[PDB]
Design an enzyme around this catalytic site. Structure first.
Site, PDB file in Angstrom:
ATOM      1  N   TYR A  88       6.514  -0.881 -10.522  1.00 53.64           N
ATOM      2  CA  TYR A  88       6.465  -0.898 -11.978  1.00 53.64           C
ATOM      3  C   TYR A  88       6.590   0.480 -12.608  1.00 53.64           C
ATOM      4  O   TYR A  88       6.444   0.603 -13.825  1.00 53.64           O
ATOM      5  CB  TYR A  88       5.182  -1.580 -12.448  1.00 53.64           C
ATOM      6  CG  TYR A  88       5.168  -3.052 -12.131  1.00 53.64           C
ATOM      7  CD1 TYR A  88       4.390  -3.552 -11.106  1.00 53.64           C
ATOM      8  CD2 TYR A  88       5.963  -3.936 -12.837  1.00 53.64           C
ATOM      9  CE1 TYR A  88       4.387  -4.890 -10.806  1.00 53.64           C
ATOM     10  CE2 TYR A  88       5.966  -5.278 -12.544  1.00 53.64           C
ATOM     11  CZ  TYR A  88       5.176  -5.746 -11.528  1.00 53.64           C
ATOM     12  OH  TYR A  88       5.175  -7.084 -11.232  1.00 53.64           O
TER      13      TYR A  88
HETATM   14  C1  F43 Z   1       5.949  -6.456  -4.313  1.00 51.56           C
HETATM   15  C2  F43 Z   1       4.649  -6.670  -5.103  1.00 51.56           C
HETATM   16  C3  F43 Z   1       4.118  -5.283  -5.488  1.00 51.56           C
HETATM   17  C4  F43 Z   1       4.651  -5.070  -6.877  1.00 51.56           C
HETATM   18  O1  F43 Z   1       4.692  -4.007  -7.486  1.00 51.56           O
HETATM   19  N1  F43 Z   1       4.959  -6.265  -7.396  1.00 51.56           N
HETATM   20  C5  F43 Z   1       4.835  -7.390  -6.467  1.00 51.56           C
HETATM   21  C6  F43 Z   1       5.993  -8.394  -6.648  1.00 51.56           C
HETATM   22  C7  F43 Z   1       6.314  -8.709  -8.106  1.00 51.56           C
HETATM   23  C8  F43 Z   1       7.532  -9.531  -8.471  1.00 51.56           C
HETATM   24  C9  F43 Z   1       7.750 -10.691  -7.500  1.00 51.56           C
HETATM   25  C10 F43 Z   1       9.155 -11.283  -7.584  1.00 51.56           C
HETATM   26  C11 F43 Z   1       9.933 -11.129  -6.318  1.00 51.56           C
HETATM   27  O2  F43 Z   1       9.612 -11.647  -5.276  1.00 51.56           O
HETATM   28  O3  F43 Z   1      10.987 -10.368  -6.456  1.00 51.56           O
HETATM   29  C12 F43 Z   1       7.094  -9.892  -9.912  1.00 51.56           C
HETATM   30  C13 F43 Z   1       7.561 -11.285 -10.376  1.00 51.56           C
HETATM   31  C14 F43 Z   1       7.561  -8.849 -10.946  1.00 51.56           C
HETATM   32  C15 F43 Z   1       9.021  -8.996 -11.315  1.00 51.56           C
HETATM   33  N2  F43 Z   1       9.882  -8.253 -10.639  1.00 51.56           N
HETATM   34  O4  F43 Z   1       9.366  -9.778 -12.205  1.00 51.56           O
HETATM   35  C16 F43 Z   1       5.585  -9.897  -9.824  1.00 51.56           C
HETATM   36  N3  F43 Z   1       5.150  -9.342  -8.777  1.00 51.56           N
HETATM   37 NI1  F43 Z   1       3.185  -9.591  -8.090  1.00 51.56          NI
HETATM   38  N4  F43 Z   1       2.946 -11.256  -9.232  1.00 51.56           N
HETATM   39  C17 F43 Z   1       1.931 -12.101  -9.360  1.00 51.56           C
HETATM   40  C18 F43 Z   1       0.686 -11.922  -8.749  1.00 51.56           C
HETATM   41  C19 F43 Z   1       0.488 -11.081  -7.654  1.00 51.56           C
HETATM   42  C20 F43 Z   1      -0.717 -11.157  -6.762  1.00 51.56           C
HETATM   43  C21 F43 Z   1      -0.536 -12.406  -5.897  1.00 51.56           C
HETATM   44  C22 F43 Z   1      -1.757 -12.714  -5.035  1.00 51.56           C
HETATM   45  C23 F43 Z   1      -1.611 -13.962  -4.223  1.00 51.56           C
HETATM   46  O5  F43 Z   1      -2.463 -14.354  -3.459  1.00 51.56           O
HETATM   47  O6  F43 Z   1      -0.412 -14.480  -4.296  1.00 51.56           O
HETATM   48  C24 F43 Z   1      -0.500  -9.945  -5.821  1.00 51.56           C
HETATM   49  C25 F43 Z   1      -1.447  -8.783  -6.063  1.00 51.56           C
HETATM   50  C26 F43 Z   1      -2.885  -9.201  -6.136  1.00 51.56           C
HETATM   51  O7  F43 Z   1      -3.439  -9.300  -4.960  1.00 51.56           O
HETATM   52  O8  F43 Z   1      -3.392  -9.632  -7.149  1.00 51.56           O
HETATM   53  C27 F43 Z   1       0.908  -9.551  -6.161  1.00 51.56           C
HETATM   54  C28 F43 Z   1       1.553  -8.602  -5.431  1.00 51.56           C
HETATM   55  C29 F43 Z   1       2.879  -8.125  -5.549  1.00 51.56           C
HETATM   56  N5  F43 Z   1       3.582  -8.165  -6.631  1.00 51.56           N
HETATM   57  C30 F43 Z   1       3.573  -7.514  -4.336  1.00 51.56           C
HETATM   58  C31 F43 Z   1       4.062  -8.708  -3.509  1.00 51.56           C
HETATM   59  C32 F43 Z   1       2.956  -9.358  -2.680  1.00 51.56           C
HETATM   60  C33 F43 Z   1       3.485 -10.069  -1.479  1.00 51.56           C
HETATM   61  O9  F43 Z   1       4.234  -9.552  -0.680  1.00 51.56           O
HETATM   62  O10 F43 Z   1       2.950 -11.249  -1.310  1.00 51.56           O
HETATM   63  N6  F43 Z   1       1.375 -10.114  -7.281  1.00 51.56           N
HETATM   64  C34 F43 Z   1      -0.387 -12.764  -9.253  1.00 51.56           C
HETATM   65  O11 F43 Z   1      -1.563 -12.424  -9.243  1.00 51.56           O
HETATM   66  C35 F43 Z   1       0.014 -14.116  -9.765  1.00 51.56           C
HETATM   67  C36 F43 Z   1       1.255 -14.093 -10.647  1.00 51.56           C
HETATM   68  C37 F43 Z   1       2.432 -13.395  -9.965  1.00 51.56           C
HETATM   69  C38 F43 Z   1       3.435 -12.799 -10.957  1.00 51.56           C
HETATM   70  C39 F43 Z   1       4.556 -13.788 -11.253  1.00 51.56           C
HETATM   71  C40 F43 Z   1       4.350 -14.553 -12.525  1.00 51.56           C
HETATM   72  O12 F43 Z   1       3.091 -14.662 -12.848  1.00 51.56           O
HETATM   73  O13 F43 Z   1       5.257 -14.796 -13.290  1.00 51.56           O
HETATM   74  C41 F43 Z   1       4.055 -11.750 -10.039  1.00 51.56           C
HETATM   75  C42 F43 Z   1       4.696 -10.582 -10.786  1.00 51.56           C
HETATM   76  C1  LIG Z   2       4.156   3.493 -16.879  1.00 46.75           C
HETATM   77  C2  LIG Z   2       5.559   3.577 -17.463  1.00 46.75           C
HETATM   78  O1  LIG Z   2       6.493   3.685 -16.395  1.00 46.75           O
HETATM   79  P1  LIG Z   2       7.415   4.998 -16.302  1.00 46.75           P
HETATM   80  O2  LIG Z   2       6.476   6.135 -16.627  1.00 46.75           O
HETATM   81  O3  LIG Z   2       8.482   4.750 -17.339  1.00 46.75           O
HETATM   82  O4  LIG Z   2       7.907   4.992 -14.877  1.00 46.75           O
HETATM   83  C3  LIG Z   2       5.861   2.352 -18.316  1.00 46.75           C
HETATM   84  N1  LIG Z   2       5.529   1.139 -17.592  1.00 46.75           N
HETATM   85  C4  LIG Z   2       4.878   0.085 -18.341  1.00 46.75           C
HETATM   86  O5  LIG Z   2       3.896   0.667 -19.202  1.00 46.75           O
HETATM   87  C5  LIG Z   2       4.240  -0.950 -17.428  1.00 46.75           C
HETATM   88  C6  LIG Z   2       5.196  -2.107 -17.196  1.00 46.75           C
HETATM   89  C7  LIG Z   2       4.777  -2.927 -15.990  1.00 46.75           C
HETATM   90  C8  LIG Z   2       3.415  -3.583 -16.169  1.00 46.75           C
HETATM   91  C9  LIG Z   2       3.068  -4.348 -14.899  1.00 46.75           C
HETATM   92  C10 LIG Z   2       1.724  -5.047 -15.001  1.00 46.75           C
HETATM   93  S1  LIG Z   2       0.461  -3.778 -15.207  1.00 46.75           S
HETATM   94  C11 LIG Z   2       7.276   2.372 -18.819  1.00 46.75           C
HETATM   95  O6  LIG Z   2       7.993   1.364 -18.641  1.00 46.75           O
HETATM   96  O7  LIG Z   2       7.684   3.401 -19.401  1.00 46.75           O
HETATM   97  O1  LIG Z   3       0.833  -5.705  -6.130  1.00 47.51           O
HETATM   98  S1  LIG Z   3       0.407  -5.135  -7.452  1.00 47.51           S
HETATM   99  O2  LIG Z   3      -1.052  -5.397  -7.696  1.00 47.51           O
HETATM  100  O3  LIG Z   3       0.431  -3.633  -7.424  1.00 47.51           O
HETATM  101  C1  LIG Z   3       1.412  -5.804  -8.800  1.00 47.51           C
HETATM  102  C2  LIG Z   3       1.130  -7.295  -8.940  1.00 47.51           C
HETATM  103  S2  LIG Z   3       1.843  -7.905 -10.491  1.00 47.51           S
END
Ligand code: F43
Ligand SMILES: C[C@@H](OP(=O)(O)O)[C@H](NC(=O)CCCCCCS)C(=O)O
Ligand SMILES: O=S(=O)(O)CCS
Lengths: 247, 560, 220, 429, 431, 56
Positions: free
Chosen positions: D363
């Site tokens: 992010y």
């Molecule tokens: C790669 C990351 C790290 C990162 O920066 N973002 C990820 C992935 C990203 C992608 C997943 C899409 C894809 O597969 O390309 C998106 C949808 C963001 C996007 N690009 O639109 C997202 N997460 Ni994440 N992510 C979520 C969540 C979570 C929860 C999932 C826990 C569980 O047991 O499944 C955990 C973190 C935590 O422990 O809370 C999580 C991690 C992670 N999140 C791990 C992937 C974990 C894995 O390999 O299983 N997300 C959630 O807590 C639920 C909602 C879900 C979001 C999608 C939606 O709500 O629309 C998604 C939100």
């Molecule tokens: C931190 C900052 O990122 P950069 O400093 O631009 O790399 C900023 N992100 C956003 O505030 C967060 C978007 C993603 C939120 C994920 C759930 S916390 C942005 O887009 O400018």
């Molecule tokens: O895997 S991370 O907690 O850093 C992002 C989940 S939306």
């Protein structure tokens, strides 16, 4: 010196939490170093550790007082890559929780980067240091093969209802039951291993509940623990007040 | 409440114990702690089958890889069943895919309605005309000028049928003035509100007259949100010049051009700093009070818990799925961080239980009124929040399906904290009391389960407790004023939706007419909008069924 | 113009080869580009039980790579490659390859609907998120680790080419809007200089497009 | 409130120095550091010549074909320095200094302080330096009347078309004031790699200078009025400036085999011994809740412990990555083990949470070296969490990708030649 | 070394042979003091704060927080509030801090010390420190429970930090936030013509002098005056704004009773020819005499002086402030027609005059000349040679504008007119 | 025109010049004015239409 106390709480969950934070954990199984390397998947089993940069002795270091005062870890003197070991723990009475895995890693190991999430808990360090931490986390009661496991991706399953077999859900099916013992056959990112790793007999449900660090109305209600609730209230009251005025 | 608890149970029954599509989940015990994962793959959804078929077809048609579920690492999506979502407080069953804002037309139309709307003050323009132009303004003249504004604003070179959603209305705190004006252009505070609500609105706006301006939705989509103010200013100037028989070109008329264009113009949002640079009328500058006011649930209902919950639902959607899910982040989306607070009635069940608890302990302090409310202290916040959080945790630990539903810890933490903060603000009538209850709920959640949320969900919740009551410069504002541009709230999901519902509750429980801005409550108090702000959560469900017709569609100027 | 962005692949590749010790070969790039073209339109590639943007509404989204390396363009799947030599005359192609060097770039075009429901600041964020996720899926690295952040920072800032820059505070508008799109970028967007040789027709086409884009849209 | 300030070697600099005497608005050396950061700017003569020759000017990927000017700026860098000093200087013999750094490739332009006192902010330094360089180029290299724009944009990038000099070759320690997240944040807008490079990778020098900038920017933003002045000064003295040598004592005692837990024990032991906290209540299970007798002093102890723990963790691992986890978990386990709030009352802990998230996810953010005090991720701690980030980056060993060189080569090369920056603790003391 | 001598507002001599180099923003002590006082001074509206607390009308246009009203006698305790705020804003007991209760306690005037300015990158330290001091004083003195602290804070910091600035707050300086500048160095501009007219009590020449002081300070801040351009700007400022050599007072006096813009052009061109600033470079067959400038910076200074004189004549003749948008345009245009040389600022003054005209004579009237300042998109173009004319015009109005200078700048007039360097800019600049 | 008469490949940014040398764009950037002409006669098909989700 100052003897750590590590946590409030008189229940069995408080006792387990103090165990994990202080690391006074009991051996429960053996995992061969080749098996550990294979399951991690960052390098071929029994092969020399890659380097992301030269050794500290080979390239010298700047004149930091902190560098000369702090002893570089054995995995940093060799310039190893900063690899990871990630774990997914079940809410249904797994013997460990993310924040207390993190407390374990932070209190007991040097130069680690423990990160805590709800569904996964990652530990990053040089390859040898991470090998040590993964060895301890795998060979102790902290990790239940049925209710835990290495997962470098697709960690979904920590909050999902367990299987009838007694093991957490795994989308990629890294490990599972085989003949009464949880057998692991993929590295922590679902790259299959040529070998089968035998992690032992999974603990009974009563055993896991007797040695879990998660409050649950089924086993140990958080509502009935007045001491942890009081700790929360005291810390919160101080935070709010001193945010208003530091006095 | 038992009735809400019952509907929560029914939602779990219709979600897990009942089969959806072809996941073969029929049967089960929503209080049971085990299940078997069939691993049917994304082809169990049927709608996902539609998406797979469309993606493959587009891949052959265009000539490059488009959408292949096999490029999900490991195995495709859906190794556990695809169970639906039920919109809180209603019975429309929605698939998860339909609640992604790209796939929900009503979800888009909400933001396209807040974005394209502006309110321009009108006393100064009439005063300038009267004093420094001699052309006395009479209600007949206002009628004619508003007729001129109403269709000029659509553009008159804009297409007659392409801008049908482009109109202007007026509302006035002067009771005698709004009586004569043609009712087709007037928002009447006295008959859209109750007597006491309208009394407070009139008392707060005074004897002033305002315009509610809505530029065409297609114009808002094409450009950004900062075009709304300029389009409105230009149409206002044109209407003033063409309706009051004033020559364009003399110097004195430029004073009126200023006065009517932008001297009393109130924007929905404001400017943002560099990293998130954006202009006015974007979700980052939209306050929590402004979102509380755009939701007309207060105007049309006496239940404070329902009002706070409806504001929470809409808020999560606007601030998570659109703002943080798309603008700041993009990608797949954040639809499931948001559906937690407006689907499956866990939040409603917790909040109604908290209402019962407060009314039982504090002599109905959570009932409507302003004198029964308990003064906000640490003891009250600690009591209400902890009990709320403990009950929510006991419900997750007692219904394994509710835990699996909010599988990611962030959803559970948001639901618990929203319930606790809404309960505290209801009991105390203080929005910051709701905030502090929210943060205490987060702390109880963390210490009880050993896990709170995603990696950075705890940022504004560790910073949460201490900043609620500070009066330092960049820390502290009443919640009603806070927004996504607040320093703690600028970059994290699962909070800003519940924060708006917290501020709404502090004033909903008092029977207040508006949260922070009366011009917004009256501006959006118009049932002519294509979106229904009286109940937004029912609107998202309507979009997810493909039964919402939005504005800004270009079908008339496009090949068929 | 609004939904389009360019992100370099060489800095992310250096990050992968250093931090993780991976090998970045043409076959891995083929796999990664296929992954990315899956993930850019709004689909998941890593974790499970989530929504995904409907492929019918985001069918105008894709990612292509153009490179000043002749070979690296040669053994990459020719469905994800913008061939400079084929598209440009050999003199112009030589000038372009001299200008960019032996570096690879991605040409990301996020969905039209996402850009209409949002502003022009949308593009870099969406592109960086999907690029990071595609790296994670295709190169078998952990979901969350420092290398992922470096890739995100590379895509978002270090190797991003925006159509327009961000405007000052007084102009109440943001990045990748028509006000940040300088005249050189608008000249380069218009592809008459690549297609025809009449030096006056090129200028007239740029005038015709710029008058619309600036006066009608930006200034209203 | 009187502390001692100890340099990074653990030696005694000054004894009994009153805390209020050490404030940004009162200390002479801090004011001089602020003035130098405001007025000094660095010019990349090599980059200017490269843009002129190749036409690669105006941002990323930009290049004007057919207008290349072939000037030997690097060869005649001394005459360029003399003429730029002649142009920039307001009066002869004033504080205007221009030096040629690193064999002609770069310049150091420090505009006179009069140009600062005669303007609203620091941008006069950048604009005057760019104007002086452009004028000297046009003067000594005989640029045609119609080639003036190219010589101008080889220095100014795309300004005014862009808010800042995007693609330019003149830059300062601080970004443009338009990039602030709030009122007074300009002094906070210095990325971590800049402080790491300026002090030549010295951990308790990078920490000291970063904390100096953070506290200057927080005083400017009305963060120290009344009791909060003491609250922030205690934190600055204890963490940034090594008050009474607590940080370095802890570093030595937990260096060879220390962890986060041992540093937590060290902080709690020192607090209990000094009396900053005492046992308030004892629960039935034997856990002793502690109460902070001196609340600002306890915050200072938590901040000092945070910095010491970051030293220990990121020096044992030799990775700047671990700084986020150190900042989070030191405070988190401190709260768990004493019953008191962490440094800055959960603010440092939450900043560590967000900074660990954004450096470990898709992010944004980036490595620890791209975070500053103005970053939306880390703009929350009142000066107690960014010093640790800068110290961690200075304490890395080739693990990061966006290294100090990559992002701040020019800044390091130019501003590492000022003694008041290489030795910030000595300057302040 | 270019040397002029300065003639004061009534045409008297001020001092002989002032080097124009000793007259730039970066050298003159009076200009530096004016800049510092602009940076540090801020005015607090105690009556507004009290009304916000009582009614909940705080945080911006239309906002009102219901049910959380605090009733504090802020205006009644204004002396105590001012004393406590001076205690909180100081750095030392006896610095240059000053808090004065203006107009019966309805508002406060707090000027932060020079140390708060020198130890911060820009001018917002005074604003933030004054606002924080007032909020702290309210919390301490009126016994606000910690759950009412947000209300007491946002009655001062209206809707900040949610908004980039204190939107609805009752603490305001003269300069806008550093984010809201048009560009690099533009901050020290952005003081509208109404404020300058109020500060000088509508003394047209004094208002022009002060406005030119601000505009040239902004120019020097931007890096638009280095070397020969420094000479250019110094000559322009000295000739136009500061009435050097009495060349503008004499022109106004000569076109006193019966004189239009054309007569001013004739007088200025006559003086330019007599002083040798320009000569007859050619002579076309029709008898036209193309002129060549022997000193281009000096010819620009003469054109600027003539532009100011023409604005004086054509706005005092009609006693209207709307004649600048045409005076600046047509004077320079007719001047170039007459002499064959370029207008003031080589056409930039004429362009900015067209800007004033279309932005103030149109249906896009954004307000009369009283809102003009150098920190605007429409008025930022000329290098400090036009805005002095706008300020002079507004100082020369007879009440034909909708906004009286009093109604919009009374507090600023009280705060700054009490300072000698602001009522009499030329005498202080002359030193 | 400053560079077109020189036959240059790009004006100021080659990355933008090569990025838009794609034929999948719904808009033809080779003939922009011709594209406007096509749009003006109701014969241009833009993307971003929501007819799938919108009711009929
Ligand atoms: C790669 C990351 C790290 C990162 O920066 N973002 C990820 C992935 C990203 C992608 C997943 C899409 C894809 O597969 O390309 C998106 C949808 C963001 C996007 N690009 O639109 C997202 N997460 Ni994440 N992510 C979520 C969540 C979570 C929860 C999932 C826990 C569980 O047991 O499944 C955990 C973190 C935590 O422990 O809370 C999580 C991690 C992670 N999140 C791990 C992937 C974990 C894995 O390999 O299983 N997300 C959630 O807590 C639920 C909602 C879900 C979001 C999608 C939606 O709500 O629309 C998604 C939100
Ligand atoms: C931190 C900052 O990122 P950069 O400093 O631009 O790399 C900023 N992100 C956003 O505030 C967060 C978007 C993603 C939120 C994920 C759930 S916390 C942005 O887009 O400018
Ligand atoms: O895997 S991370 O907690 O850093 C992002 C989940 S939306």
């Amino acid at each position: 010196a100052y003897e750590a106390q590590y946590y409030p709480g008189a229940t069995s969950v408080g006792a387990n939490r103090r165990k994990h934070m202080s690391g006074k954990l009991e051996k429960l199984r053996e995992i061969s170093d080749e098996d550990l390397t294979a399951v991690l998947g960052h390098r071929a089993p029994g092969s020399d550790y890659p380097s992301t940069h030269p050794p500290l002795a080979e390239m010298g270091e700047p004149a930091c007082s902190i560098r000369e005062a702090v002893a570089a870890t054995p995995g940093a003197a060799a310039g190893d890559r900063v690899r990871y070991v990630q774990f997914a723990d079940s809410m249904y009475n797994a013997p460990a929780t993310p924040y207390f895995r993190s407390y374990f890693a932070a209190i007991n190991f040097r130069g680690v980067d423990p990160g805590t999430l709800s569904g996964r808990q990652i530990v990053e360090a040089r390859e040898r240091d991470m090998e040590q931490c993964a060895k301890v986390q795998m060979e102790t009661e902290m990790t239940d093969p049925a209710l835990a496991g290495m997962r470098g991706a697709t960690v979904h399953g920590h909050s999902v209802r367990l299987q009838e077999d007694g093991v957490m859900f795994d989308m990629l099916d890294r490990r599972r039951l085989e003949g009464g013992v949880i057998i692991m056959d993929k590295d922590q990112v679902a790259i299959p291993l040529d070998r089968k790793v035998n992690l032992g007999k999974p603990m009974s449900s009563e055993e896991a509940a007797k040695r879990t660090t998660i409050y649950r109305v089924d086993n140990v209600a958080f509502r009935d623990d007045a001491e942890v609730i009081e700790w929360v209230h005291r810390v919160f009251d101080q935070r709010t007040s001193y945010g208003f005025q530091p006095k | 409440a038992a009735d809400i608890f019952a509907k929560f149970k029914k939602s779990m029954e219709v979600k897990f114990t009942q089969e959806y599509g072809s996941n073969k989940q029929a049967g089960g015990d929503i209080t049971g702690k085990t299940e078997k994962f069939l691993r049917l793959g994304p082809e169990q959804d049927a709608r996902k089958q539609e998406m797979i078929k469309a993606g493959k077809e587009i891949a052959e048609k265009r000539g490059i890889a488009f959408y292949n579920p096999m490029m999900h690492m490991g195995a495709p999506l859906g190794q556990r069943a695809i169970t639906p979502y039920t919109i809180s407080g209603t019975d429309i069953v929605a698939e998860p895919d339909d609640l992604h804002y790209v796939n929900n037309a009503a979800m888009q139309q909400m933001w396209d309605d807040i974005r394209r709307t502006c309110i321009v003050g009108l006393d100064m323009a009439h005063e300038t005309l009267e004093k420094r132009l001699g052309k006395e303004v009479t209600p007949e003249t206002i009628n004619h000028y508003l007729e001129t504004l109403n269709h000029a604003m659509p553009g008159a070179e804009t297409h007659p049928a392409l801008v049908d959603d482009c109109y202007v209305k007026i509302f006035t705190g002067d009771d005698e003035l709004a009586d004569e004006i043609d009712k087709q252009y007037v928002i009447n505070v006295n008959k859209m509100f109750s007597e006491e609500q309208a009394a407070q609105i009139k008392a707060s706006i005074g004897k002033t007259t305002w315009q509610a301006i809505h530029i065409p939705t297609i114009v808002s989509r094409t450009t950004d949100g900062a075009q709304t103010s300029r389009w409105a200013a230009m149409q206002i100037g044109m209407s003033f010049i063409s309706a009051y028989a004033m020559c364009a070109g003399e110097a004195a008329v430029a004073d009126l051009s200023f006065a009517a264009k932008h001297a009393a113009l109130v924007s929905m949002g404001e400017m943002l700093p560099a990293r998130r640079a954006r202009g006015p009328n974007e979700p980052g500058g939209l306050s929590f009070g402004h979102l509380s006011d755009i939701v007309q649930t207060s105007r049309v209902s006496k239940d404070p818990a329902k009002i706070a919950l409806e504001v929470v639902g809409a808020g999560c959607m606007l601030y998570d799925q659109i703002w943080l899910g798309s603008y700041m982040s993009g990608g797949v989306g954040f639809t499931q961080y948001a559906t937690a607070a407006y689907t499956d009635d866990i939040l409603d069940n917790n909040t109604y239980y908290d209402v019962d608890y407060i009314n039982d302990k504090y002599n109905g302090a959570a009932n409507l009124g302003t004198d029964n409310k308990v003064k906000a202290t640490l003891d009250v916040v600690k009591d209400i929040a902890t009990e709320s959080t403990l009950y929510g945790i006991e419900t997750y630990e007692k219904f394994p399906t509710a835990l699996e539903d909010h599988f990611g810890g962030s959803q559970r933490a948001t639901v618990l904290a929203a319930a606790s903060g809404v309960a505290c603000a209801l009991a105390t009538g203080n929005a910051n009391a709701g905030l502090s209850g929210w943060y205490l709920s987060m702390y109880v959640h963390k210490e009880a389960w050993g896990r709170l949320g995603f990696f950075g969900f705890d940022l504004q919740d560790q910073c949460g407790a201490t900043n609620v009551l500070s009066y330092q410069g960049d820390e502290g504002l009443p919640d009603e004023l806070r927004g996504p541009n607040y320093p703690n709230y600028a970059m994290n999901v699962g909070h800003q939706g519940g924060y708006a519902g917290i501020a709404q509750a502090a004033h909903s429980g008092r029977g207040d007419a508006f949260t922070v801005n009366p011009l917004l409550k009256v501006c959006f108090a118009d049932e002519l909008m294509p979106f229904n702000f009286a109940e937004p959560r029912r609107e998202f469900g309507r979009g997810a069924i493909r039964e919402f017709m939005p504005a800004g569609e270009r079908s008339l100027v496009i090949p068929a | 113009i609004r939904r389009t962005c360019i992100v370099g692949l060489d800095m992310a590749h250096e990050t992968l080869e250093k931090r993780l010790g991976k090998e970045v070969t043409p076959e891995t790039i083929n796999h990664y580009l296929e992954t990315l073209n899956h993930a850019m339109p709004g689909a998941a590639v890593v974790q499970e039980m989530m929504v995904e943007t409907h492929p019918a509404l985001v069918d105008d989204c894709y990612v292509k790579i153009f490179t000043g390396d002749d070979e690296l363009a040669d053994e990459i799947d020719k469905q994800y490659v913008i061939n400079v030599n084929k598209m440009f005359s050999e003199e112009q192609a030589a000038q372009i390859k001299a200008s960019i060097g032996k570096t690879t770039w991605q040409a990301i075009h996020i969905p039209t609907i996402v850009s209409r429901t949002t502003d022009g600041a949308q593009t870099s964020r969406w592109a960086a998120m999907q690029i990071g996720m595609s790296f994670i899926s295709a190169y078998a690295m952990c979901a969350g680790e420092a290398a992922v952040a470096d890739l995100s920072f590379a895509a978002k800032h270090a190797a991003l080419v925006s159509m327009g820059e961000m405007l000052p505070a007084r102009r109440a508008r943001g990045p990748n809007e028509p006000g940040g799109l300088s005249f050189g970028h608008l000249s380069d967007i218009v592809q008459t200089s690549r297609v025809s040789k009449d030096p006056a027709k090129i200028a007239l086409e740029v005038v015709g497009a710029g008058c619309m884009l600036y006066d009608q849209i930006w200034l209203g | 409130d009187t502390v001692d300030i100890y340099d990074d070697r653990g030696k005694l600099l000054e004894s009994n120095v009153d805390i209020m005497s050490l404030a940004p608005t009162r200390n002479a050396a801090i004011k001089k550091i602020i003035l130098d950061t405001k007025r000094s700017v660095a010019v990349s003569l090599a980059g200017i010549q490269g843009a002129l020759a190749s036409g690669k000017m105006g941002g990323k990927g930009r290049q004007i074909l057919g207008r290349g000017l072939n000037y030997d700026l690097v060869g005649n860098a001394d005459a360029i320095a003399e003429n730029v000093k002649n142009l920039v200087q307001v009066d002869e013999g004033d504080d205007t200094s221009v030096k040629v750094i690193k064999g002609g490739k770069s310049l150091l332009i420090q505009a006179p302080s009069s140009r600062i006192a005669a303007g609203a902010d620091y941008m006069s330094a950048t604009t005057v330096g760019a104007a002086a360089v452009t004028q000297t180029i046009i003067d000594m290299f005989g640029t045609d009347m119609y080639d003036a724009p190219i010589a101008k944009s080889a220095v100014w990038g795309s300004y005014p078309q862009t808010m800042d000099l995007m693609g330019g070759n003149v830059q300062g320690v601080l970004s443009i004031p338009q990039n602030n997240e709030g009122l007074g944040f300009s002094l906070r807008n210095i990325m971590a790699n800049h402080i790491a490079a300026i002090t030549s990778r010295g951990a308790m020098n990078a920490a000291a200078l970063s904390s100096i900038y953070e506290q200057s920017g927080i005083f400017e933003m009305g963060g120290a009025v009344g009791m909060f002045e003491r609250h922030q000064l205690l934190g600055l003295a204890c963490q940034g400036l090594n008050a009474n040598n607590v940080v370095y004592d802890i570093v030595k005692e937990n260096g060879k085999d220390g962890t986060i837990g041992t540093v937590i024990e060290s902080i709690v032991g020192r607090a209990v011994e000094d009396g900053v906290i005492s046992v308030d209540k004892t629960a039935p299970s034997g856990y002793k809740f502690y109460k902070a007798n001196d609340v600002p002093m306890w915050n200072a102890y938590a901040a000092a412990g945070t910095l010491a723990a970051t030293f220990v963790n990121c020096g044992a691992g030799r990775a700047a990555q671990n700084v986020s986890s150190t900042l989070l978990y030191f405070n988190d386990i401190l709260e768990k083990e004493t019953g008191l709030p962490g440094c800055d009352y959960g603010k440092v802990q939450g900043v560590a949470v967000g900074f660990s998230f954004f450096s470990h996810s898709i992010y944004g953010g980036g490595g620890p070296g791209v975070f500053n005090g103005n970053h939306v991720v880390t703009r929350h701690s009142r000066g107690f969490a960014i010093p640790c980030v800068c110290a961690a980056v200075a304490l890395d060993a080739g693990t990061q990708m966006f290294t100090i060189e990559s992002t701040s080569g020019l800044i390091g090369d130019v501003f590492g030649s000022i003694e008041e920056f290489r030795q910030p603790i000595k300057a302040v003391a």
